[PDB]
A paper describes a structure:
The structural and zinc-binding properties of PA4063, one of the periplasmic proteins expressed by Pseudomonas aeruginosa under zinc-deficient conditions, are presented. PA4063 has a noncanonical ferredoxin-like fold. Two zinc-binding sites with micromolar affinity are exposed and are located on the same face of the structure. Two histidine-rich loops, which are disordered in the apoprotein, contribute to zinc coordination in one of the sites. These findings strongly suggest a role for PA4063 in zinc trafficking, possibly acting as a metal chaperone or as a regulator of a transport system.
The structure of PA4063 in complex with zinc was solved by soaking crystals in zinc acetate solution since crystallization did not occur in presence of zinc. Later, a higher resolution (2.85 Å) data set was collected from a zinc-soaked tetragonal crystal, confirming the positions of the two zinc-binding sites and allowing a better determination of the complex geometry and coordination distances. Site a is located on the flat surface of the β-sheet in correspondence with the histidine residues. The same mode of binding is detected in all three monomers of the hexagonal crystal: besides His124 and His126, the zinc ion binds to Glu87, likely as a monodentate ligand, and a water molecule, adopting a tetrahedral coordination geometry. The water molecule is not visible in the tetragonal crystal, where zinc appears to be coordinated by only three ligands. Comparison with the apo structure shows that coordination requires rearrangement of the donor side chains, which move closer to the site, while Glu35 is displaced. Site b is about 20 Å from site a, on the edge of the β-sheet where the His-rich sequences are inserted. Notably, a few residues belonging to these sequences, which are disordered in apo PA4063, become structured and take part in zinc coordination, although some variability is present. As for site a, the coordination is tetrahedral and three donor groups are provided by one glutamate, Glu47, and two histidines, His16 and His18. The fourth donor was modelled as a water molecule in monomer A of the hexagonal crystal, while in monomers B and C, as well as in the tetragonal crystal, the electron-density map indicates His120 to be the donor.
Numbering used by the authors: 15 to 93, 119 to 179
The structure:
């Protein structure tokens, strides 16, 4: 799907491993999808790329759970419709303390995003949910 204002989040939590795949039209992240001609356009892309480099902050992961970034890919053309793909593998020393997942911070920092669609998979099974700025929590 490429619906402006909607992003997909796949989440896989197995023991100490946390895996996060975000797919999004750029419209909700930089505010356009045209090539980055100008240099008030180039700044807008650098800002986005920077917030996407700090997943512990953007996904508001508890510090209690001792989560570390193992690895991180950010593919996009901007790095005539355009997507942005972000992939993160994370290692958490105390995953028992990963109770909830808030996209509150995400909606804060990319407010042109109206909805995120979450797949979660753990050893417990598969969970699905539309998150909105109102309703932005999911129980793991
Ligand atoms: Zn588009
Ligand atoms: Zn990927």
């Amino acid at each position: 799907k490429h619906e402006h204002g909607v992003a997909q989040l796949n989440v896989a939590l197995d023991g100490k491993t946390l895996e996060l795949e975000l797919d999004s039209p750029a419209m909700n992240l930089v505010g356009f999808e045209h090539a980055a001609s100008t240099d008030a356009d180039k700044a807008a892309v650098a800002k986005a790329r920077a917030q996407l480099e700090k997943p512990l902050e953007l996904f508001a992961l508890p510090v209690t759970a001792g989560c570390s970034v193992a690895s991180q890919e950010l593919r996009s053309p901007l790095f005539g419709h355009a997507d942005i793909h972000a992939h993160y593998q994370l290692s958490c020393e105390k995953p028992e303390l990963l109770k909830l997942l808030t996209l509150a911070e995400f909606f804060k920092r990319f407010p042109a995003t109206q909805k995120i669609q979450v797949q979660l998979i753990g050893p417990d099974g598969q969970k699905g949910a539309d998150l909105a700025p109102a309703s932005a929590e999911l129980k793991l």
